[PDB]
RNA sequence: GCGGGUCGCGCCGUCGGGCCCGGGGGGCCACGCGCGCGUCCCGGGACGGCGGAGCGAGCGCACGGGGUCGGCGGCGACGU
RNA sequence: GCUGCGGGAUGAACCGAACGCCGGGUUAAGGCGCCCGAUGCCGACGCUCAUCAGACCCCAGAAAAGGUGUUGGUUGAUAUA
RNA sequence: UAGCGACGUCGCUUUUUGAUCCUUCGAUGUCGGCUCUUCCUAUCAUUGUGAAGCAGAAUUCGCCAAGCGUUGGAUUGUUC
RNA sequence: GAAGCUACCAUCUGUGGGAUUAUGACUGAACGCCUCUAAGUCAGAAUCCCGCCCAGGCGGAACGAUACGGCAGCGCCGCGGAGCCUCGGUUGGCCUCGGAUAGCCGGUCCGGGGUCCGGUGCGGAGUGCCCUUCGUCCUGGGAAACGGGGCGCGGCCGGAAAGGCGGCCGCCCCCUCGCCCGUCACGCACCGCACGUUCGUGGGGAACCUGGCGCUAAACCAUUCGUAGACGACCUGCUUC
């Protein structure tokens, strides 16, 4: 319980606001609200943003108290956060979504077609497995 | 078409106003668990203008004129007509079109209820203020219905474990042919276009 | 075969609090919920469908017992992603909380 | 001010255990077990060390009456941890006026039944809760024990006799009889 | 020594004089070569008039042009 | 009074604004939970728990006084002697 | 400061009286009593309580509280 | 002075549960202590609500009888044909309880504990499934031993709060193109146009001809009665023993 928390030197994605779908890194934090967040390599620049309009993830980094763009891009990229961000299970989901966001109508009758595809052959192997579970049960 | 809703969690002015809004349109929908809608403040302020809103009556003849309900059910059917224009052949079909329920009604505990997030006491409330129960209410003046309500609401909890769980087997199942073989080819298709 | 237009709820008249104005209608539209998304559907044509016992058609084949009054998307109206619309004919204020077919031509795909 | 955390430090000894699904307290020693409910304050309940026991009852931001009542978790863990390993025990020595009072127990120590009363010929009867029981004392006159293991249950059954126990319509500064508590304390005392 | 006016020198400033006398890419609704009529300047540029000198003419068309037309196209009967 | 119209639920005087019949756009006074058109903005800051909460000039109710209920603020006084 | 409270001061009520004339002059029948129904609390008693200069009894001051009671008569047309 | 009305002028009866106000408390911080309170617990009354008692809703149940006669008339199942009225949608989702300072899934051990996953939820309503299939024929790859619809039969009740579809077993007239990938040729190609495709064998009302199974009444008036009555209304009798 609470795994998670602000800190100084936190990665954490933006959900809401101009800067949607880019990562930024809390600095510190000014007063209860507003955290003065700063992006190295993701694209957006060293500003004050709402902790309701970020949203905490759970990679940390080696942030010395207020440092400079220079040792925060030294600590990203010693800490490598684009490649094993990537590599996870949560920027799948975003993709994903980003991908049927940009389907279109041949993508979709695709998608039908191997959904009819795929759905026949679990039904026939459900129907298979539910079949040999009774023939177990029986004696 | 119907748009059965929970009522287990969600506050009455907000649930009533979505409702009162959403039947305007002509979607049918039906509040179901109307005995476990919150009221937020205190419970003793609950009763007490509940209290007044029971000696608000007519002296000359109490029947011809307020008519007070007891059950929460027509509470929230109350609330309803007090924001519909039910003196007008519109607001007036939209109370026609409007049902309601205390406990689950047999076609509603098959159908699935849906739960609407803009009235919720976690959503809308601090956790840290007092809140009341429409049933509790409801059985504390008048409704007197709420040990048959609460023993057939245990027994569709009950019969609705002896379908999750055959619900929950059945999912086993279809994951154990997913985690079996010969279906990836569809699969290079679909996880490049969302999976 | 299949639905060719989108789902559209007749609201209410142009109108401020206690006067209508007849000649300008309001449409919820489905899946528009925003300002942003009631942008697509600026110039689409609509089409209210009702019944009479008369015989009043449309050269399709056969005679019927439909008849519809015809009208176009003017602009957009409200933050909640609400449709005006003028009609040819003025509405019959039956049509309240019933459905109005959108239906996909000429806008600018 | 909206304070940030307020953390207060428990230690538990090595003859109890403690046992939490969520903000539920278990406290299971060797005078029985004890549970609790802590749902409706929304207080973080931590615990750690192999062996070692330590729990910390922590808040963050909240407001000042929150910060309040931060500490009433950390008191009555406490006092759950003295009533499982000691327990608890009221004693109650009945200062009696002329007329004397006299007190038995009746449904094996959890039915007080007082007789004479000031007088008045209407023989009481108190029911006390399940987890404490009652006694008569030896070696002191009408003295009345009252032991168990939750301190709320212990004290609500002695506020009960103190309360049936009561002069009506009268002066009470005059005529100063009933059933007051005389000693808190344990079971297992030198502790 | 502190103030008011003026004169003389230097430093600037996509400043102003179509800036000029004479030298070592872009834009301009800016044009009769023969030679000779006066003003200004150093054989050449500006102006009124004549020495050159607007020589030949409205031919067709598009007009973001004195408040739109199609020399665009469909569809239906004995009860509408 | 001699004066409609939009808000103030309802109104003679209030606030905008004055009236030939209409279409389009915009706005004032006002409002955007439902009646009842409009915040369904992933609105911002902080205060308030009221067993008689509070909710918009005229306007349809309230004082002197008191509160270790909470939030700021001023003047001070103690404390490793 | 149990109960009181001067000198001063802040409020509530229309159960008295006063002030105005806003409606009513082609009429709103003007006192009291009898009978009858409902409501309020600023509580006389009853139910549950707190405080006294409350020993008991009997009283006084307050709170939640209008559910139920709140007479028979001589006098006066009486309200009183 | 009978019957009947009537008298506190005679006689009988008038009934208990809950949440709580005032108040007194418990634990316990704020504020090392204290405290009835700030989150929590207790006792608590002619107050409040319900019980009991009255009339029962444009409120719903369960059950009986449902039209003889000599032609009749009327219900249930499955039928084909025509025609009048009324108004709405153009796939359906067959379901865990509960929390939000916490919760979901998988799983050895004795419903619980340990362990292993995922978690701005992907065992997800930014979702899942028959699904965008216009149809037919030939010819082949992958999947498929359940076949796939039922005028189908028989058993089980799943479910009682407002229930009618779903599941299993044994056969039946049959189907191995019930679905995705490829080849082939056609069906109205109605020559630029709308209300088109839907759960529809839509709701109820009056009749027309055919198959099977059946049904053979009850109110109201009249008359009588008094336990009732202004008139209506209410309770009653009517067999030939
Ligand atoms: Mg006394
Ligand atoms: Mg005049
Ligand atoms: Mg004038
Ligand atoms: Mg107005
Ligand atoms: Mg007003
Ligand atoms: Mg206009
Ligand atoms: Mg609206
Ligand atoms: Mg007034
Ligand atoms: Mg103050
Ligand atoms: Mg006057
Ligand atoms: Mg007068
Ligand atoms: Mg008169
Ligand atoms: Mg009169
Ligand atoms: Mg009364
Ligand atoms: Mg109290």
Redesign the pocket.
Known sequence: ???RFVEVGRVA?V??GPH?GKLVAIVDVI???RALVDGPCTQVRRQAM?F??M??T?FILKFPHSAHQKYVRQAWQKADINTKWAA???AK??E??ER?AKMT?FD??KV??????????????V??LQ?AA?LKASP | ??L?L?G??HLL?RL???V???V?L?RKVVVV?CE?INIS?????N??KY?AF??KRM?TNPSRGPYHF?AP?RIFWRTVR????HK?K??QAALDRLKV???????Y??????VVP?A???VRL?????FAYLGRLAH???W?YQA??AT??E???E??????RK???L??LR?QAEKNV?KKI?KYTEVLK?? | ?????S?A?F??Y??????Q?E??A?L?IEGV??RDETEFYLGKRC?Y?????????????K??????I?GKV??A??????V?A?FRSNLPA??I???I?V?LYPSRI | ??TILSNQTVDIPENVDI?????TVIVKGPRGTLRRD????????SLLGKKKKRLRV???????????????????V??MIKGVTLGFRYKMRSVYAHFPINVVIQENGSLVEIRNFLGEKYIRRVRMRPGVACSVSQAQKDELILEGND??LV??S???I??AT?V????????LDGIY?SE?GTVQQAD
């Open positions: 319980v609470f795994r994605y959900s809401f949607a007063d209860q609200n709402p309701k309009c949203q905490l759970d996870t299970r949560w989901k975003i994903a979504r049927k109508d979709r009758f039908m077609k191997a959904k009819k595809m795929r759905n026949r052959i679990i039904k026939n192997e129907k298979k079949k009774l | 078409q119907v059965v929970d287990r969690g002015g009533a106003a979505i009162a809004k959403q305007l002509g668990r476990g403040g205190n419970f003793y302020r009763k007490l209290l029971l000696r002296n007891r059910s007090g924001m519909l224009p007008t519109r607001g329920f205390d406990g689950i009604p047999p076609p505990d098959k159908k699935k209820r849906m803009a919720l006491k976690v601090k956790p840290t203020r007092k504390e003046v008048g007197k048959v309500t057939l609401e027994k569709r909890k019969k609705a474990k002896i379908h999750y619900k929950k087997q999912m086993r994951k010969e569809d969302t999976h | 075969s299949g639905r060719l237009w789902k709820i609201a209410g142009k109108r401020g609090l206690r006067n104005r000649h300008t309001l919820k919920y925003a089409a469908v009702y019944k009479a016992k008369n015989n009043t058609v449309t050269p399709g084949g005679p019927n017992k439909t008849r519809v015809w003017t602009r109206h409200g933050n909640s992603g609400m005006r003028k039956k049509a909380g019933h459905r077919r239906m | 001010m909206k046992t939490l699904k969520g903000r802590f749902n409706h304050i929304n207080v973080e309940l922590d808040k963050w931001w909240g407001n000042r009456k929150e910060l309040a009542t931060v500490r009433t978790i950390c008191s009555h406490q006092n301190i709320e004290s609500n002695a506020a009960l103190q309360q009561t009506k319509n009268k002066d009470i500064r005059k005529f508590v808190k």
